[PDB]
Amino acid sequence: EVVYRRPEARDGTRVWELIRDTGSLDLNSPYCYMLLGDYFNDTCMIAEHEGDIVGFISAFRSPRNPETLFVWQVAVASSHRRQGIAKAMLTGLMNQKACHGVRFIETTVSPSNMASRRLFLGYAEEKSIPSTVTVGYGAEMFPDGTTHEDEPLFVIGPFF
Amino acid sequence: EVVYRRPEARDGTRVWELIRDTGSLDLNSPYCYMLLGDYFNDTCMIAEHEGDIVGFISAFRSPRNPETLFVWQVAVASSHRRQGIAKAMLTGLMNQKACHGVRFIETTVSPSNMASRRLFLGYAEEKSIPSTVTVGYGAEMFPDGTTHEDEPLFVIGPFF
Ligand SMILES: CC(C)(COP(=O)(O)OP(=O)(O)OC[C@H]1O[C@@H](n2cnc3c(N)ncnc32)[C@H](O)[C@@H]1OP(=O)(O)O)[C@@H](O)C(=O)NCCC(=O)NCCS
Ligand SMILES: CC(C)(COP(=O)(O)OP(=O)(O)OC[C@H]1O[C@@H](n2cnc3c(N)ncnc32)[C@H](O)[C@@H]1OP(=O)(O)O)[C@@H](O)C(=O)NCCC(=O)NCCS
């Protein structure tokens, strides 16, 4: 019943609205999500249920180090959380030919974001892949006026 | 007196504030600009004057077609406009080894954005490089609630 597909530029508004409706502090412009759909969609995925976008994942292969897949946004609509949708987006993304050759997954996860931590660490555990945590982007790096949590870096791999 | 350098993740807040202060509808998250500084900085540039960020350009090499450099954001602080700063950012970006092998520059420019149109078309004219305009992202693609201009696609090249 949930379908997993690539986003397209035409999806940018509905992906933006999905992320907007999470309340995320890390919402990008609509234009950004349009561009992802046209230029990065080999490393992104949408989950849709009965026509509604219910999930999104965006990643890029690092320009300098293309064996690194950096996952920079994952979102599932609240009404559809804790049903395995993010896990299926992540697992599906990695199973495609576009991710052949990825040896590390890297992402940031705030200390309070248990859901995301378990998404990534559960994927690593499933595959018996090591994980480490380093400094990422501390709270103090963010603009004054808008409190943000620390964003430590999760490095998952090597996967081969 | 203006210095042209790569952004770093530590610059993300000041780049965000620069773009915020333009009033652009296409402002991304602070986190986005942090990521650009760590992962895309071979295809970005900052202009700084007496320690203040006064300009920014962000681009990526298209994953599917790395001979295409897509320029997705250019901003100069109002007080420093029409002094050649964007032209120097763009020209400097293309002169680096990181852009060796770029054969096309692609970007979107609204019909009313003469400044940006002249930035790009003036760069093409300087180099006697052809340019074409196609459909890009129309106004109707953007979220209801926030009126956006059409974003036609400019394709500049081949440069070789
Ligand atoms: C993170 C998020 C995408 C997870 O989506 P989801 O579809 O609900 O996740 P899943 O159901 O696939 O679960 C993934 C794992 O996390 C666990 N999990 C999920 N939500 C959890 C919660 N609230 N508490 C504890 N564990 C949780 C699951 O048990 C599963 O673990 P497993 O791999 O050991 O089985 C979702 O909570 C979300 O959108 N959060 C807001 C946006 C966000 O913070 N994104 C990440 C930063 S960009
Ligand atoms: C577009 C922008 C970056 C240009 O920066 P800038 O440093 O003022 O531009 P420059 O001084 O380098 O000028 C570039 C060219 O545009 C012309 N130009 C600049 N501003 C102009 C204006 N307001 N009207 C007409 N021509 C203008 C220049 O004469 C020059 O032309 P040339 O190449 O034929 O000599 C700036 O106007 C800006 O930040 N705009 C708001 C953000 C934006 O719209 N960005 C683009 C979309 S992401």
Automatic annotation (TrEMBL), chains A, B:
Enzyme class: transferase
Keywords: Acyltransferase, Transferase
Organism of origin: Geobacillus sp. (strain Y412MC10)
Keyword Transferase appears in the UniProt entry: yes
EC assignment: 2.3.1.178
Protein name (database record): L-2,4-diaminobutyric acid acetyltransferase
Residues the record lists as binding CoA: 74, 76, 82, 84, 86-87, 113, 118
